[PDB]
């Protein structure tokens, strides 16, 4: 869907006064003020500079009339507030010519010929789409540093938030989202030289938020693609902050999601960002503390790779491998997988515990199918009406009751997990039920089907075994969801790996207790002189690429020494 | 390709109904009335649209 | 029509050479000019250039509005015949330049960054006038 | 240079029976036996040519420094490693020559807990010799370097009694994950020096270099390893395919077959 919903003005148009503009008439010549104030715009529209000159000059001599003191605010009025409050630097700003640098610094002047500049420069716009638009973002758009350095010099403020409805409420339409502060505006349209000149500025924050409760960053998180572009500046956009940062606590600001930038980054989808993010091979000294990749040796090919593991695996709340799993709509999660932090630690994971603990439930289900195909072939029928759905066998001998309580309580223990883990997540008619909730639900309505036999036998019903033989087949129907662990039996390879990523957070999710699992090195030294922390991992490199390791941690052991 | 057909179907059915419009179809057109870059052509506009490919080198 | 565009200037350059003559179809060089360019695959696109490279040449609307003798807009031929691909030329067509603006049909204003304010002619393109492209 | 000068005044004072031995114990920390150059040429440096060049004047100056060169790592972890041995590892042939120049050994077998099976537990078995590494990561000209000293030995075994070939047999692994230089760096050896007696060479576990390829499963050296025509008359003997009647698409062939059938034991087929 691609409309573009223009919904207030066509905001600075050659067009018409169709809009009504007789609001100040002040006649003495067939017109005063709209043949001064139009002719400006024009003026301001082309760049004819004396025909200017002599137009400032007669304002002036307009604004030379008897106000008192009520004359800068009349230059307020005669200058803006037509509709929209804009200014000449607005309409100069969007064209130009170039003849702009010259008309600026003759129009700057004027207003420094009063006393109202500083409240003239920073000007915006009481038109609703674009209410919180300066003059900056346009010589931001249209990249006039060298204006931009006179804006400078002018003391514009430099933290301004363009909170109209130029962003949008929907996704890719109706307006881009920058996210309204001036800083990220050149910063996410590749002006490296005004990033680093407003960076440079003591007043530019860097913290301040959006109204959506934004850094730089999560702008900078909604730009990127789908793919290894032609050298993209948005990657190399990144570091260029952070390496001027020089503060880890940047990235731990949350939103108005309460989500890091790199949570956000699982949810917006973006892989090549999130693959560099997840890096920072920081080789320059200093900084080399918001690093994430640490070479702990290398000595020769296979190094002992070492990453940042601090928000990564769920051991706090809303990780960021929970939400590539369940999180749907983004088609790239398979791809995304690639990635080592994420990749081996599956590989991880599946080794210490989930090999075990999924064979098992498969094993307590495998034999279910046994007790359940076994008793309704065996004896359900006693030779006139008794139905027997549960056969009691009052005698000694116990046979049929040690089933019975085998049958029916591990029904409980599929309905009570399944009527919980349904109790997650709603899905929408389509591939989420279907691919994700599509043997969960076959578990789910095999679960109440096996009980609902036990109420067959209220006052002697009539469908105690035609019902209750649709539970034995289908029992052995959903064993393909089973046979899932195999690699010679599970791109549909990808779609079946993420299919038992959904099982190996549902296991960690029947892990109640201590988590004595533990997956990691926990705790060590990071190169910081107090920054022991930040639990870790353990990977290993081969054959390309072959230069030196100036940065590492010891003087080449492979393990600890003793 | 048959909501292509259908495409013409609800274009057959449009054109009958603005076929019959009765004696004013004023207004019910466009934003127009623009002021083209001229002396003398004051005609008929209509509005705006939208592309996302900003994403260039630009050095 | 054979795609020879020195020679066409060769043309353009000699005073004599009327542009506004119509033939037993009454057609001008835009109609028949219209009438062959049939695809983009077998052919490389040079009409759509051809067709800019006359108007800029030397052009007003009398030889956009001229009808042919069965009464027929070159616009309107277009539409009629298929020329699916030039009808996208036909369309937009932004010209920069202050004597070259009336011809044109694309007005682009509010544009900034991402985003890029559309303004089109139409004008014998509503229903307002017997047999609109439409 | 300050600490240099400061220690050659107080090596200056206690000179009645250890001028050599005492300054040897104040250049190696005691712990691992790691001189200041061994920690010299881990911590790499864009400055270190000259820092090099400085330090070994000092050991020039008090005339122990081929006892100080040609140390060995003595910890018992991964001993016998020379600082010579982290410079290959380093590539910094540049100075590498220099300390080819100082006369370091060429000869030197680091034994220790590398090497050792359960590749996280690092080893890296390039079988300990400092020709192996630069030709086994890759370093052809300091290789072309190592075979410009007469000292240079190529016969030398290891642990496992294996040559220069053998440990190279051992690294290949794959096309997709090498550039396919080992196959290069193979064939470099042989035509730079090379007999049969290097090839018919065993390991100390009884093996040949041939065979070693095949119990290993290094599938693409062995496609190498077998057809390998040399045309050069003192070059053709070490050759295995002999090609003579070729008439433009046919072409003759001829294989060796030495250690191939089954005549003797322990065949690779």
Redesign the interface.
Known sequence: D?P?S?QDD???????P?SPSANLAKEEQRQKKKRLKKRIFAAVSEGCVEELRELLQDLQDLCRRRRGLDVPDFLMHKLTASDTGKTCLMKALLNINPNTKEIVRILLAFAEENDILDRFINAEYTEEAYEGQTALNIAI?RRQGDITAVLIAAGADVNAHAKGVFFNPKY?????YFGETPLALAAC??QPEIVQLLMENEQTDITSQDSRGNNILHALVTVA?DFK?????VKRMYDMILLRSGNWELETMRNNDGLTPLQLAAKMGKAEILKYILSREIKEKPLRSLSRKFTDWA????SSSLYDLTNVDTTTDNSVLEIIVYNTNIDNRHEMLTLEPLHTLLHTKWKKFAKYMFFLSFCFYFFYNITLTLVSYYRPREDEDLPHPLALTHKMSWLQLLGRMFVLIWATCISVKEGIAIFLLRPSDLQSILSDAWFHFVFFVQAVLVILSVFLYLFAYKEYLACLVLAMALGWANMLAYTRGFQSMGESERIWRLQRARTILEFEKMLPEWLRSRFRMGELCKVADEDFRLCLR?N?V???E?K?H?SFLN?????I?R
């Open positions: 691609s573009q223009p066509v905001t600075e148009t050659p067009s018409n169709n758009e890719q339409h109706e307006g881009f349209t590749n693609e572009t032609q050298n993209d500046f000595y020769g090919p296979v353990i290993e081969k054959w390309t072959w030196t100036v003087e080449d052991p492979g393990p020494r």
